[PDB]
């Protein structure tokens, strides 16, 4: 039980962000960002681009740190504390279609408009958005 | 070997911040902020107050997130990668003096004016400042 670092990516395309339904013990079936565990020696930007590539195939650019959130899943059956570093990015090719590279972990990735976000959102994302956080302007 | 989360605290007192020379494997003899490892189940604000109390005896309040930095210590004798969450705080009692609670880990804590910081600064702290980061106005 130690806090673990994740990097999560807001890929902005027009007024939309990329989200996908998790297949996981935590946040199962909820809509979440691409992202994953930060590796030893890795920068935030390296992690963001690598995770997006592994999960979606998408090539990203203009990465920028947004914020960091503390996410303790106190009532999970196994200890889960994540510190999630949010990165903004855009596509090198805004017409590039997302692929579902890891179907065991995600139902598929799709674009959602900022004014018509899907439900249910993964709790850390719900919590961050409930605070007023806006990845387009932060 | 994994990235580990630390919380570091900019205690603002007038135009000064608290710094102390480290006694450590990492950043030995360099001036650094109070702070340390985030514990499982702890918030960033709770960690800031706890670490400051442990290291300095100071009572702080109005803890606010500033930023996060990614610091891989290639010079360390063991794999050392810290994701360092910066918190701003102030003293509950502006007359309270710091105390060197852990003299085996620090040479002592003092206040330094923003325009006349001491040298050598611990390099992650120096890098943050070199970017234009100002904890008073951020
Ligand atoms: N993927 C994703 N993870 C998030 C979000 N918000 C958030 O706190 N996290 C935290 C909780 C996740 O369990 C944690 C690690 O990400 P993950 O569950 O996608 O793990 P992963 O398999 O991609 O990690 P890896 O094996 O690729 O290193 O990051 C989000 O919106 N998306
Ligand atoms: N104290 C402190 N640590 C910093 C700074 N910048 C930075 O990257 N770190 C990283 C490097 C340290 O090896 C790492 C852990 O902090 P630390 O050495 O003070 O750890 P600690 O013993 O106080 O942790 P704990 O046992 O009290 O919980 O945090 C800073 O300005 N101050
Ligand atoms: Mg992944
Ligand atoms: Mg993932
Ligand atoms: Mg400590
Ligand atoms: Mg410390």
UniProtKB/Swiss-Prot annotation, chains A, B:
Ranges spanned by the short sequence motif Nudix box, renumbered to the chain: 36-57
Where is Mg(2+) annotated to bind? 51, 55
Q: What are its cofactors?
A: Mg(2+); Mn(2+)
What's the domain of life for this entry? Eukaryota
Q: What is its EC number?
A: 3.6.1.55, 3.6.1.67, 3.6.1.22
**Which leading EC class covers this enzyme?**
hydrolase
- The Nudix hydrolase domain, residue ranges: 2-135
- Cite the SUPFAM superfamilies for this sequence: Nudix
What is an example of a GO molecular function annotated in this UniProt entry? NAD+ diphosphatase activity
Which subcellular locations apply to this protein?
Answer: Cytoplasm
Q: What is its main location?
A: cytoplasm
> So what family is this one in?
Belongs to the Nudix hydrolase family.
Q: What protein does this entry describe?
A: Nudix hydrolase 1
Organism equals Arabidopsis thaliana
